[PDB]
Design a protein around this ligand. Structure first.
Ligand SMILES: Nc1ncnc2c1ncn2[C@@H]1O[C@H](COP(=O)(O)OP(=O)(O)O)[C@@H](O)[C@H]1O
Lengths: 143, 343
């Protein structure tokens, strides 16, 4: 957003960008796309008709989406045939796609630590526990 | 010879140009005497500078751009104000050439808004003949998405005046004083560029208690009411300040010279749905007959934007198909998906 400070240089860049989005009319082959993780700090002048428009909405993956995403990023790794990706999705909540790949990476790393070739379901569970830096301790008061 | 003649005259103009030298662009900031000025270069120091004899003294007012000689340091000629899309405010946005017929079913509300805002800006002679200061400000309240912003753009297009649109919820910033500062900059901006339609979004954030953050909303409210009605210049700009909840609004914010005329814009009227579909679906190529009453009954509680999404999404269904809009089932499924998927 807008705010003589030293930001008056990137301001000219943004205004020149705005000028070019409004300079060219639709129906031509110059379709633009833009990506950002925080639209809260984005100048709404960028989000005006003739400029970008059509804000595509990217949500945190749901359970089935999380299971699917965790499936894609394990195709290149020798995952065991018996891994319940659905149960993995149940045990992975509030997890973005990057973490849904990091769980597979950490499961493979833990499998390497255990000295095994194929990744068991327990390796994936330990990856889920380790992707969020949690350490699993067998508490005595549960039994 | 003739082509050589033309290019040789051009080359002689170039030869004369080679002798010509540049001037530093400067800006006059004061006029000490009738041969003294204080001119500041764009990026440079300030020089006490005189004016060329073949130059009018009056035209060089404080703020007049000039191009003085860079050796004698004397003004040689005036320059008009610099133009660039460097503006930090919404004035450069164009409301778009949209007529009052584009917004459908608000004929009464449209007429009241014209009477409130268009009259003082187009024909003030009526108001000065009666003897009343021209009214300024109209308050549009209704369900969200009903088309108040479109109405503001239609007025700003017919009046052919600069238009400022602002999200009032955005202006209240966590840091102290910036919330009122934004209103202050907005109003001083409207002073320079006149006439101005100051369309403010949902005011319930600004308009309508023991903490600093709550007294901040009080302070920005007082700044707003001072900007609209009060000291300095009573000005001619108009405001289309619109809200979503009218009871929250401060009673002082509803006064004749202080944003009167609570126009109610309810969800698109029963007959208004037909007109809205006519204006927003007519441009879409469709040879097939329409059962508009069926769509209107299937779209209850819809808002103005929903109909435009229905039209665009029906076009999308056509895109995923042959290309031509032929059947009502498309409007039905468009309405349903603009009903369930837009919830
Ligand atoms: N009554 C209406 N008639 C025609 N179009 C409308 C109407 N209401 C809304 N629209 C469409 O919805 C879009 C956005 O509406 P907007 O002005 O944001 O509504 P609001 O001001 O209530 O938020 C406009 O581009 C306009 O085409």
């Amino acid at each position: 957003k807008r705010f003589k400070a030293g930001d008056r240089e990137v301001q000219r860049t943004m205004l020149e960008l705005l000028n070019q989005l409004d300079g060219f009319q639709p129906n031509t082959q110059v379709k633009v796309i833009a990506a950002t993780n925080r639209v809260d700090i984005l100048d709404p002048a960028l989000l005006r008709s003739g400029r970008l428009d059509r804000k595509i909405e990217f949500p945190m993956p749901n359970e089935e989406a999380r299971a699917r995403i965790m499936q894609i990023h394990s195709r290149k790794m020798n995952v065991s045939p018996d891994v319940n990706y659905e149960e993995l999705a149940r045990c992975t909540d509030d997890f973005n796609g990057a973490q849904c790949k990091a769980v597979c990476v950490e499961a493979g790393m833990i499998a390497l630590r255990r000295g095994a070739t194929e990744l068991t379901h327990e390796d994936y569970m330990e990856g889920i526990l380790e992707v969020q830096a949690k350490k699993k301790a067998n508490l005595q008061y549960y039994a | 010879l003739k082509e050589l003649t033309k290019q040789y005259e051009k080359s002689e103009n170039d030869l004369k140009a080679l002798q010509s030298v540049g001037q530093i662009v400067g800006e006059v900031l004061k006029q000490l005497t009738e041969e003294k000025f204080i001119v500041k270069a764009t990026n440079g120091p300030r020089y006490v500078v005189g004016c060329r004899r073949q130059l009018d003294k009056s035209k060089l007012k404080p703020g007049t751009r000039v191009a003085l000689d860079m050796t004698t340091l004397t003004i040689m000629r005036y320059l008009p104000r610099e133009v660039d899309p460097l503006v930090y405010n919404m004035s450069h946005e164009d409301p778009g050439n949209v007529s009052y017929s584009e917004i459908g079913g608000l004929s009464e509300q449209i007429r009241e808004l014209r009477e409130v805002i268009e009259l003082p800006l187009t024909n003030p002679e009526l108001f000065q003949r009666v003897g009343i200061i021209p009214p300024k400000g109209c308050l549009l309240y209704g369900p969200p998405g009903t088309g108040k912003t479109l109405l503001a753009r239609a007025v700003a297009s017919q009046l052919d005046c600069n238009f400022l649109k602002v999200v009032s919820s955005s202006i209240v910033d966590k840091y102290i004083g910036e919330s009122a500062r934004l209103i202050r900059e907005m109003f001083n901006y409207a002073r320079d560029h006149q006439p101005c339609i100051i369309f403010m979004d949902e005011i319930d954030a600004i308009g309508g208690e023991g903490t600093s953050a709550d007294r901040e909303i009080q302070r920005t409210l007082m700044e707003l009411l001072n900007q609209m009605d009060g000291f300095d210049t009573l000005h001619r700009v108009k405001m289309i300040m619109a809200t979503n909840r009218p009871d929250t609004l401060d009673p002082a914010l509803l006064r004749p010279g202080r944003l009167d005329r609570k126009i109610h814009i309810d969800l698109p009227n029963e007959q208004a749905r037909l007109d809205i579909l006519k204006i927003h679906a007519g441009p879409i190529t469709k040879h097939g007959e329409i059962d508009y009453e069926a769509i209107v009954k299937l779209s209850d509680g819809f808002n103005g934007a929903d109909l435009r999404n229905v039209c665009t999404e029906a076009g999308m269904f056509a895109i995923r198909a042959d290309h031509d809009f032929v059947v009502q089932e498309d409007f039905m499924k468009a309405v349903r998906k603009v009903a369930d998927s837009k919830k």
